[PDB]
Amino acid sequence: MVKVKFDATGEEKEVETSKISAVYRTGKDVLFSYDDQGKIGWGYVSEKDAPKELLDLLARAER
Amino acid sequence: SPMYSIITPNILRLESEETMVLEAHDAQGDVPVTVTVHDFPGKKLVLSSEKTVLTPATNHMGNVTFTIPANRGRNKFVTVQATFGTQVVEKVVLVSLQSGYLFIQTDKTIYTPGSTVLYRIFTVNHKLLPVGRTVMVNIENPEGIPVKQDSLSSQNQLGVLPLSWDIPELVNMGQWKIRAYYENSPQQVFSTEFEVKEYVLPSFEVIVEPTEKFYYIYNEKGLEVTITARFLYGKKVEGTAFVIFGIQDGEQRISLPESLKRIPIEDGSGEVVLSRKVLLDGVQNPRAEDLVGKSLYVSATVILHSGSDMVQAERSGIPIVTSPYQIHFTKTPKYFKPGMPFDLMVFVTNPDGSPAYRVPVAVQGEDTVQSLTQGDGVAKLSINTHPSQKPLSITVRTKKQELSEAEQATRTMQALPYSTVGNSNNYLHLSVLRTELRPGETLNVNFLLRMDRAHEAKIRYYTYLIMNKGRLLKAGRQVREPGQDLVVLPLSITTDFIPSFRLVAYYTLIGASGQREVVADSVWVDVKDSCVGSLVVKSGQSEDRQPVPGQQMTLKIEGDHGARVVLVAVDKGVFVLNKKNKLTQSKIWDVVEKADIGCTPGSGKDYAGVFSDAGLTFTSSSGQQTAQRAELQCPQ
Amino acid sequence: DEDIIAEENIVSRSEFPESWLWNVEDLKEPPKNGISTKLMNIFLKDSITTWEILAVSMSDKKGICVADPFEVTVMQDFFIDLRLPYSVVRNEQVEIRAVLYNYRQNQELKVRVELLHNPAFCSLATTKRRHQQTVTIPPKSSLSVPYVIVPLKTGLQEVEVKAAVYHHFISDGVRKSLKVVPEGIRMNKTVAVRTLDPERLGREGVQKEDIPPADLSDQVPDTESETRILLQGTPVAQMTEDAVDAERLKHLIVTPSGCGEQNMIGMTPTVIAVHYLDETEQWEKFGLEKRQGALELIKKGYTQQLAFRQPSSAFAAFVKRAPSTWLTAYVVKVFSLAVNLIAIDSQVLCGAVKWLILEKQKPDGVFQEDAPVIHQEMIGGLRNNNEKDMALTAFVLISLQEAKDICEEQVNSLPGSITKAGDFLEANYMNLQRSYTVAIAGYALAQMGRLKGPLLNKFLTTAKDKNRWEDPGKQLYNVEATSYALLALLQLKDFDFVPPVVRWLNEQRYYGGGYGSTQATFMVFQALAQYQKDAPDHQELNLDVSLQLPSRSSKITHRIHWESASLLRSEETKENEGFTVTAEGKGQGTLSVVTMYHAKAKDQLTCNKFDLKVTIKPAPAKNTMILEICTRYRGDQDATMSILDISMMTGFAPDTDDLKQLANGVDRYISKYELDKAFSDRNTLIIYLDKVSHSEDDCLAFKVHQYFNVELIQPGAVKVYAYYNLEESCTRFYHPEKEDGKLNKLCRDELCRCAEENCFIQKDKVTLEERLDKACEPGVDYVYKTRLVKVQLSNDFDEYIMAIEQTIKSGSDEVQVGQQRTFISPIKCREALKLEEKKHYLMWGLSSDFWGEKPNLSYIIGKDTWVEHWPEEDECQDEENQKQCQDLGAFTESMVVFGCPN
Ligand SMILES: *[C@@H]1O[C@H](CO)[C@@H](O[C@@H]2O[C@H](CO)[C@@H](O[C@@H]3O[C@H](CO)[C@@H](O)[C@H](O)[C@@H]3O)[C@H](O)[C@H]2NC(C)=O)[C@H](O)[C@H]1NC(C)=O
Ligand SMILES: *[C@@H]1O[C@H](CO)[C@@H](O)[C@H](O)[C@H]1NC(C)=O
């Protein structure tokens, strides 16, 4: 369970951690790739709204 | 199918070096390219003299610089031809007659009859750089009537034309114009005005500004104003002050005679108020809300306690407003990429159109992502998109903690889906941190890819191009190894990226339906505005105290080596009477922000619609090219 | 007194520029620390303010760079701000403040500020007695010193007050100039507005419209009269019916397919599409891209058709068909000026023109129509069996004309051919009926200029009221026919007769591309392309317009033409006279002549929105006079607040309890700052009013006290203005010994000299010994014995008319012993003069005391003029008279007998 917000209408997709393609960082915030329908879909998530699973998969792929 | 792409700027400039980008995609060996430029129609070959051979040791990128000389509604064009051995790639690009910009300094803002007006015209091309053209000058009167027409060339004067016109004693009192324009470009005219008048430099200046820079209609404390009164030599003024207020919508004013108040100036500072009762009564007795979108002025008249001297000064523009703030999506791309994240460049101003600092702004709703405005009065705000090709309606708000929710400004906007070849639903996005960029810093530019995994192997590079001052500043490649869904560009900003730059990128592939496809996207990047070089003026003379009349001092002039500096001292008296049409580097940049061939903050409908909208003509050897550019101005 | 800087040893602050340092110092110094440091020693001006230096940098590497404004602050512990206006009206008495600024931390200074006498100004300053006031200013403060004066001299004039501190070395002298202006007001006036056309006006010559000088009947004396002349030279744009829409020309881009003629008819229109769109630069709204995509076709149509080229340099229908006259004749014409469009083999064309004249034309000058092009519908109106040898011959000669200029080298034999047939179509083109064949043949010669009056006005007449040529038949026959004709009209350059034909075309809205349009299509659009490059909107402009001015010695000629920008030539004389203008050339310009001066004064001065009355009378320390100020608003409703800016009379200050009274007023208020300024040195004062009435006169007065007894006390003043505009306001002066607060000045119409001074020479003390020594200077010019006829004592100056008796020393006035003469004195110089009628009077005076010039000139009594009540001989017999008489009689002889030294 990693949650992706849509502040336009305030919806919530839930992405399975295993399905994630790769995790990258923008300043504070975090920004990863899906595997939607073999389409390489995306998802930005705010520093404030970063869960641990995602910060972890990042700190790996980083340092 | 090897594909050969030509990238030129949208509208070319004449007797100026502009540069076009040569690329061959999937190209064995080193390919030859000879760049030709003919007039339209026909074949004068006015600058075909440009040749080059692009290698696989640059991966088939490379360019040739050329200057189109010189001479021979009204709209001229040229056909640009880049032939790769067998293959001919030719575009027709609009061309600007208009040589560059003119800026005209006067030694003062306001003059008497009998005095000479020293004026200077700076002759500089589209890239802010000194030039040698012939320019005619006109001196219109408060009704345009050229009361002296000159015509000098700046050749070897290095951009600077020092002129003079003495004003006859029997002159038509009022608001005099000067009008300069390059001898080749009668339509590129450039104006600066100077009030002619009887007058005598005051003793003191008067500074009137309120507690606020606006009236909050529901602030029963009324529009408080402090008055200031200083002798031009610094010491404070003892006197008395006559101040009166008035509403104005829009051109017409309406004095509020009830609001006429007389106050002593003690230690050079008085304070006067305009009650809400006075204002409401004054208008019409109407409803406070009727009056929003109007504005008021205040009008202070300070007479010394001797009587010898008195000074007028008015602060105008004080707008009456519901919300201390304004949210403009004027910097924000109006095209999103289905699925990919959508970045908004929220721009918040004060009512007085000054940029707001530390203003929490957020997408409309409850616990929404909330970003703070830079010094730019720009915040950023990234929002996740759905895969649907539906229109996107986003509302933003101010989230300032002190302001009531009624008091919070709003603005709604609407991005359209980036249209896509064969509905491939391949996209490209470009993310960047929207801090304030200062040159000698590095910007990281995040090229996000969004196609299906199945063809993503082939995407091996992006081509990235940087527009600045309506000209290709530089460009190159950004490599990407398979499974690299985001690659990051380390962009070194130089003192050449001022006052801003556009970056437009494109990857291409022969994907989906055995047809070539170009994907693209632009981003605009405001740089921290300031001088390319530096110049300062300061006291060579150490400390002293106040330099005494008629005495000598020294002046340190720390400027760019091998440059012509020009000076003028002006008794600050003049600037109590009239402080308009002064030259500020800032006014200059404003000019070059208008003269932008780029007319979109970012992105664009199709691949084509990105390049035109960022001021570029892409055009390939596969039939695939930007729409033709006809309008020398940004279509409104 | 003493222990204080000597006034003479004070250099005053002269220089007060509003801008300066217009300097242009380059930067060449070794670039140490990434940035060239130029040091620049500058000398500041004496203006005590804050300067704002604004540098601009220009580097061919770094571009332009506007530096941040640097402020410098000139300042001084003690100084005078001399507060002038901009300008003063000549003979209008006004008061100037000079404010003294003791900016010491904890030290008052005993100062003596002093106005310097200028002869250009009437004031309580004069050569013999200076204007010194001593005043001490408290620490970190400023006292205001008023100076009431009259400007008598026109132009810029210079006031100069100074000051030094007693016991200390601290002085400051100023001298700002100000504009003194002639009594009157600004006034423009239109001398003349003539119209500048050399074609219509002054027919067949050079237009010479005779402009007067100005009227200037109101024109105040000694005032500049600038005659603003302007030669605005208008343009004229002869509207040309503009081109057919790109959108209707879409269907003319066909991909040339077929054989011999069918390939040809394919290519025919797409050629002319380009050539039109070329000259109407309509490629924009058409689509720039579409050109090269279409241009592709013509190449292919040219190349394809060359394989319909018989090895005789000739063009057949089929692969091997019997060669044609016409088909060949046409492709000669279509290629003829598709040469500019696509470089074509100048051998394959001029070698193909060569074949047609060789084996298809004989001595008569005709061309064979054995040219069966299968479908003869492309051919046009030559298919019909009438004038086929006369009509074709005219068309086929057209094909020679378009490819005439290019081929005249490659084949030199051809030029001969063209000319020869040119005759055979000149002789025979008079007896033709068909209005097709009329029009083609009319073009053929008109090209070669062979068509003058005779056969011109046969072809011309066929024109249906100058709109179309045609007959009964195919309606596309008439359209192609009309065009051929048109081409001629602009070939023979009759722009008069042209336009209305063009309209009849755009009426038919013909765009072509239909069964048998080939020759109709082409011809139409070729004619409309020719037209548009021949077409003038440029209505010939060229003006050699000059006018030899009476004023300047060197003429002013101007050259206003088209493809010239500067359309507003102008020069402005400062003297006013009449002057003719030479106007020759072609076009339409504009001569207007304006003139500014000083129109004479209506409702008086700048004081007609505020009536006030100032009353000075004594009351029942030392002196104490009550000052009553009565104002009223010259308007329609009670005014807002307004200012009462008062000046005290020299050595005065108002009662402190009488100001206490006034402040506690429902509509009155004085600043406590001026109430807690003790008699210290309070000689200025401001009393603010909340509302001045328009209906009653709101008065009030207060006591003043004589703080210091200095004689010759200057008149005070009371200026009263509304807060919102100082400009419109009325100051009035006041003085106990004078009438209304104005200084004694003798003023005669415009001229004004100053009379604030002694009345006669200030010397029973009347030694003859010395009297005679001081009698003979270069100065004195008239020694007279005289006798008062009549006295004219009044309100102004009091004129004494003095009968000349015997003239001792004559000056520059032709005089007898009987010539009566006018001597004038200030009213004030009544008591001191004590004059009487039919009196023996000694009156030796000083030259340039002469009011007007011969013979209305009148001797003024003066600070340098001398007077004596000469005793009557018959009553010299007194022994307290006889002492005087003697000395006087001793003088009278000893002066005149010989004369004075030299
Ligand atoms: C268009 O053509 C011009 C001229 O060929 C290109 O400018 C040139 O670009 C090269 C490579 O980017 C520059 O080399 C650089 O030198 C700097 C040192 O200042 C170094 O830091 C970089 O790593 C790089 O090696 C070269 O100086 C420059 N030459 C000039 C301006 O005269 C331009 O980039 C071309 N753009 C494209 C899209 O091809
Ligand atoms: C002439 O003076 C009048 C008076 O106001 C003014 O309206 C007009 O504009 C002036 N015209 C010129 C040419 O000075």
Author numbering:
A (entry chain C): 1 to 63
B (entry chain A): 1 to 72, 79 to 642
C (entry chain B): 730 to 1349, 1358 to 1500, 1503 to 1641
What does the paper say about this structure?
Each of the three major complement activation pathways (classical, alternative, and lectin) culminates in the cleavage of the central component, C3, into functional fragments C3a (an inflammation mediator) and C3b (an opsonin).
To determine the binding site of APL-1030 on its target, a crystal structure of C3b-bound APL-1030 was obtained at a spectral resolution of 0.3 nm. APL-1030 binds to C3b in the same binding pockets as compstatin, which are located at the interface between the MG4 and MG5 domains, but does so through different hydrogen bonds. Structural analysis indicated that the peptide residue Trp 42 forms key contacts at the interface of the C3b MG4 and MG5 domains. Additionally, we noted the insertion of the N-terminal β-hairpin of APL-1030 within a cleft in the MG4 domain that is induced by a rearrangement of a loop (residues 370 to 374), which contributes to the larger contact area of APL-1030 (11.2 nm2) as compared with the compstatin (5.53 nm2). Compstatin binds C3 at the macroglobulin (MG) domains 4 and 5 within the MG ring, a component of the structurally stable β-chain of C3, as well as its fragments C3b and C3c. Thermograms showed a single specific heat capacity peak at 65 °C and were stable for up to 1 month, demonstrating the high stability of the Nanofitin.
